[PDB]
């Protein structure tokens, strides 16, 4: 995963109603996520779900080359009877370790 596009937030250090957890563990869980892609190189994933229950990568709306290798890894939990959550997940291919400090190199009004 490259970055995330949570809609109902403004930055990394906020909260959200109806969410049992914070944002940082979400970032860590998406770090733990792994998906194989063959055809497309930088496809973008997303999810929308409500209702009280656990959240796993199996719930992600799949696509052509999207391969959920472990469709059981928990992401977060929902505590509200109407607990809609929205996010857009971008995945990218690459090599080695890329820290977020180098990621500031974009500078293209990102």
């Amino acid at each position: 995963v490259t970055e995330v596009e949570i809609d109902g937030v403004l930055h990394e250090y906020s909260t959200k109603e109806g969410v049992q957890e914070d944002i940082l563990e979400i970032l860590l869980n998406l770090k733990g996520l792994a998906v194989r892609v063959q055809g497309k190189d930088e496809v973008i994933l997303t999810l929308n779900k409500s209702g009280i229950g656990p959240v796993t990568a199996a719930d992600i709306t799949h696509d052509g080359d999207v391969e959920i290798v472990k469709p059981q890894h928990v992401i977060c939990h929902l505590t509200d009877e109407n607990a809609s959550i929205s996010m857009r997940i971008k995945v990218q291919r690459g090599r080695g370790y890329v820290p977020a400090s180098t990621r500031i190199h974009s500078e293209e009004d990102e």
Binding site: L10, H11, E12, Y13, S14, I104
Partner: protein, 100 residues
């Protein structure tokens, strides 16, 4: 003259003056580096000078905010990061901006 908190400060490009609001406060959640302007503040420098250009401009626009020394607040050197919260406190008998 009293210090004023306008978004408008010369000698710097709009790249610095992009994240500023209607008043001059950066929006919440901006990835900033060292030296980036946080809040634009100006201090009346005092004219104390007559030129064929300064009073010419003042006659052209009618605005005396020109020729005013800037005292804006910027990010300290070296430190970087993002902005999470902003608090506003104002003295009584004084209006407030849109953001407050």
């Amino acid at each position: 003259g009293p210090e004023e908190i306008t978004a408008d400060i010369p000698n710097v490009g709009e790249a610095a003056l992009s994240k500023l609001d209607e008043s001059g406060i950066v929006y919440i959640g901006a990835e900033v580096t060292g030296g980036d302007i946080l809040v634009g503040k100006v201090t009346p420098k005092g004219e104390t000078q007559l030129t064929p250009e300064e009073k010419l401009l003042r006659a052209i626009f009618g605005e005396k905010a020109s020729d005013v020394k800037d005292s804006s607040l910027r990010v300290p050197n070296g430190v970087s990061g993002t902005v999470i919260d902003v608090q506003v406190f104002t003295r009584d008998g004084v209006e407030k901006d849109k953001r407050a």
